Amino acid sequence: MSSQIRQNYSTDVEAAVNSLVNLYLQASYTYLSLGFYFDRDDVALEGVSHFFRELAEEKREGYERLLKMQNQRGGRALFQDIKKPAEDEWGKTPDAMKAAMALEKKLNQALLDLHALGSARTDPHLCDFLETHFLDEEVKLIKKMGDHLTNLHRLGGPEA
Amino acid sequence: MSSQIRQNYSTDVEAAVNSLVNLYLQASYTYLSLGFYFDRDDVALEGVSHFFRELAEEKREGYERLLKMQNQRGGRALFQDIKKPAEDEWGKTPDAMKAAMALEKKLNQALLDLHALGSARTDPHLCDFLETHFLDEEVKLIKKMGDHLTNLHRLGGPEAGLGEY
Amino acid sequence: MSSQIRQNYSTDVEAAVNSLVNLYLQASYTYLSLGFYFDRDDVALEGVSHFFRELAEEKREGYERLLKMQNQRGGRALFQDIKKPAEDEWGKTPDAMKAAMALEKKLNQALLDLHALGSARTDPHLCDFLETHFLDEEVKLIKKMGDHLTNLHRLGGPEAGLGEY
Amino acid sequence: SSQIRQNYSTDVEAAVNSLVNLYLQASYTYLSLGFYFDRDDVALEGVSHFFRELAEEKREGYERLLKMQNQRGGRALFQDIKKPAEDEWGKTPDAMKAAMALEKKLNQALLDLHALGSARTDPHLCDFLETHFLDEEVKLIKKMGDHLTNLHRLGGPEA
Amino acid sequence: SSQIRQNYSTDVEAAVNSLVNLYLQASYTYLSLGFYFDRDDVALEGVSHFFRELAEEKREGYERLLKMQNQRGGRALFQDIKKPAEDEWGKTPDAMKAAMALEKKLNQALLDLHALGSARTDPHLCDFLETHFLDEEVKLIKKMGDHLTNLHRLGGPE
Amino acid sequence: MSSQIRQNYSTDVEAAVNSLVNLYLQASYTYLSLGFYFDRDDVALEGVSHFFRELAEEKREGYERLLKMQNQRGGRALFQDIKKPAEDEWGKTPDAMKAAMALEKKLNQALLDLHALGSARTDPHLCDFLETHFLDEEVKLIKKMGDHLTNLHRLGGPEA
Ligand SMILES: [Ca+2]
Ligand SMILES: [Ca+2]
The DSSP line for C27-50 is: HHHHHHHHHHHTTSTTT--HHHHH
Ligand that lies nearest to the alpha carbon of residue A125, given by its number in the listed order: 1
Residue A119, φ and ψ in degrees, nearest 5: -65, -50
Nearest to E121 by CA among D157, F26, D115: D115
**Residue A127 vs residues A14, A119, A136: alpha-carbon distances, Å:** 13, 7, 13
Which residue type does D38 have?
Answer: D
Which residue type does B30 have?
Answer: T
Tally of residues, chain A:
160
CA–CA gap between residue B152 and residue B101 (Å, rounded) = 14
Ligand that lies nearest to the alpha carbon of residue A124, given by its number in the listed order: 1
CA–CA gap between residue C15 and residue C18 (Å, rounded) = 5
DSSP letter assigned to residue F10 = -
Nearest to F31 by CA among F107, F85, F83: F85
Contact call for residues E110 and E137 (beta carbons, < 8 A): yes
Q: Is C63 helix (H, G, I), strand (E, B) or coil?
A: helix
Which residue type does F10 have?
Answer: S
**Residue D105 vs residues D19, D22, D23, D37, D101: alpha-carbon distances, Å:** 11, 9, 10, 23, 6
Nearest to C75 by CA among D48, D38, D82, D95: D38
Name the minimum distance, in Å, from the CA of D157 to any CA of chain C: 32
User: Which of D103, D134, D146, D152 has the highest number of chain E CBs within 10 A, making it the mutation to test binding with E?
Assistant: D134
Ligand 2: distance of its center to the CA of B129 in Å? 8
Tally of residues, chain B:
165
CA–CA gap between residue A56 and residue A49 (Å, rounded) = 11
CA–CA gap between residue E146 and residue E141 (Å, rounded) = 9
Calculate ∠ Cα C121-C127-C128, nearest 5°.
Answer: 145
CA–CA gap between residue A48 and residue A97 (Å, rounded) = 9
Ligand 2: distance of its center to the CA of E120 in Å? 17
Name the minimum distance, in Å, from the CA of C21 to any CA of chain B: 29
CA–CA gap between residue D73 and residue D8 (Å, rounded) = 8
Rg (CA), chain D: 18
Q: Do chains A and B touch (3 or more CB pairs under 8 A)?
A: yes
CA–CA gap between residue F25 and residue F66 (Å, rounded) = 11
CA–CA gap between residue C63 and residue C12 (Å, rounded) = 18
CA–CA gap between residue E92 and residue E131 (Å, rounded) = 31
- F82 forms beta bridges with E81
Taking CB atoms within 8 Å and a gap of at least 24, the contacts of F84-92 are: F84/E78, F84/E79, F84/E80, F84/E81, F84/F29, F85/E78, F85/F29, F85/F30, F85/F33, F85/F34, F86/F30, F87/F33, F88/E75, F88/E76, F88/E77, F88/E78, F88/F33, F89/F37, F90/F33, F90/F34, F90/F37, F90/F38, F92/D158
CA–CA gap between residue E15 and residue D158 (Å, rounded) = 35
DSSP letter assigned to residue F41 = T
CA–CA gap between residue A116 and residue A105 (Å, rounded) = 16
Which residue type does F123 have?
Answer: D
Contact call for residues B161 and C155 (beta carbons, < 8 A): yes
Residues of F in contact with E69 (CB under 8 A): 36
* Residues near F38 by beta carbon (within 8 Å), at least 6 away in sequence: F44, F45, F46, F48, F49, F52, F90, F96
Q: Left if phi > 0, otherwise alpha if psi is -120 to 50, otherwise beta: which for A122? A: left
CA–CA gap between residue A33 and residue F108 (Å, rounded) = 62
For A147, other C-beta atoms within 10 Å of its C-beta total 10
Residues of C in contact with D39 (CB under 8 A): 71, 76
Sign of the four-CA dihedral A126, A131, A133, A135? positive
Q: Is D81 helix (H, G, I), strand (E, B) or coil?
A: strand
Sign of the four-CA dihedral B23, B29, B30, B31? positive
CA–CA gap between residue D71 and residue C162 (Å, rounded) = 32
User: Chain D within 8 Å of B135 (Cβ-Cβ)?
Assistant: yes
CA–CA gap between residue D51 and residue D96 (Å, rounded) = 9
Nearest to B95 by CA among B52, B133, B141, B127: B52
Kind plus residue range of the DSSP H or E element containing B136: helix B135-153
Calculate ∠ Cα C85-C86-C90, nearest 5°.
Answer: 90
Residues of D in contact with C39 (CB under 8 A): 66-67, 70
| Helices and strands of chain B, counted as H and E runs | 5, 0
- E81 forms beta bridges with F82
Binding site members of C for Ca(2+): 128, 131
**Inter-axis angle of helices E92-119 and E135-153, nearest 10:** 160
Residues of B in contact with C43 (CB under 8 A): 150
Rg (CA), chain A: 18
Ligand 1: distance of its center to the CA of A137 in Å? 14
Contact call for residues E48 and E41 (beta carbons, < 8 A): no
Calculate ∠ Cα D145-D151-D154, nearest 5°.
Answer: 145
Calculate ∠ Cα C14-C65-C15, nearest 5°.
Answer: 15
* Residues near F112 by beta carbon (within 8 Å), at least 6 away in sequence: none
| DSSP string across F116-130 | HHHHHTT-HHHHHHH
Which residue type does C18 have?
Answer: N
| DSSP string across D12-38 | HHHHHHHHHHHHHHHHHHHHHHHHHTT
Q: Where are the alpha helices (DSSP H) in chain F?
A: 11-38, 46-73, 93-120, 124-130, 136-154
Contact call for residues C27 and C108 (beta carbons, < 8 A): no
Contact call for residues D137 and D110 (beta carbons, < 8 A): yes
* Residues near C38 by beta carbon (within 8 Å), at least 6 away in sequence: C44, C45, C46, C48, C49, C52, C93, C96
Interface contact E145-B72, CB threshold 8 A: no
Closest partner residue to B115 (CB to CB) among D71, D123, D130 is D123
Contact call for residues E141 and E107 (beta carbons, < 8 A): yes
Name the minimum distance, in Å, from the CA of F79 to any CA of chain E: 6
For E46, other C-beta atoms within 10 Å of its C-beta total 8
Nearest to C91 by CA among C57, C129, C53, C48: C48
Ligand that lies nearest to the alpha carbon of residue D135, given by its number in the listed order: 2
Closest partner residue to E138 (CB to CB) among B3, B125, B127 is B125
Q: Is B82 helix (H, G, I), strand (E, B) or coil?
A: strand
Residue C158, φ and ψ in degrees, nearest 5: -60, -50
CA–CA gap between residue D33 and residue D28 (Å, rounded) = 9
- D81 forms beta bridges with C82
CA–CA gap between residue C108 and residue C86 (Å, rounded) = 19
F85: Cα within 13 Å, side-chain hemisphere = 24
DSSP letter assigned to residue B83 = P
Q: Is C106 helix (H, G, I), strand (E, B) or coil?
A: helix
Contact call for residues A36 and A67 (beta carbons, < 8 A): no
CA–CA gap between residue D37 and residue D39 (Å, rounded) = 6
Residues in E 110-129 with any Cβ partner in B closer than 8 A: 111, 114-115, 118, 126, 129
CA–CA gap between residue A124 and residue C92 (Å, rounded) = 57
Kind plus residue range of the DSSP H or E element containing A26: helix A11-37
Nearest to B138 by CA among B54, B62, B48: B62
CA–CA gap between residue B42 and residue B92 (Å, rounded) = 11
Q: Left if phi > 0, otherwise alpha if psi is -120 to 50, otherwise beta: which for B63? A: alpha
CA–CA gap between residue C37 and residue C88 (Å, rounded) = 8
Contact call for residues A114 and A66 (beta carbons, < 8 A): no
Residues in B 78-97 with any Cβ partner in A closer than 8 A: 78-85, 88
Cβ-in-10-Å burial (0-12, 13-18, 19+) of E57 comes to: middle
**Residue D62 vs residues A45, C36, D21, D24, D110: alpha-carbon distances, Å:** 49, 11, 8, 7, 12
**Inter-axis angle of helices F11-38 and E45-72, nearest 10:** 30
Cβ-in-10-Å burial (0-12, 13-18, 19+) of B110 comes to: middle
Contact call for residues D117 and D12 (beta carbons, < 8 A): yes
Q: Is D95 helix (H, G, I), strand (E, B) or coil?
A: helix
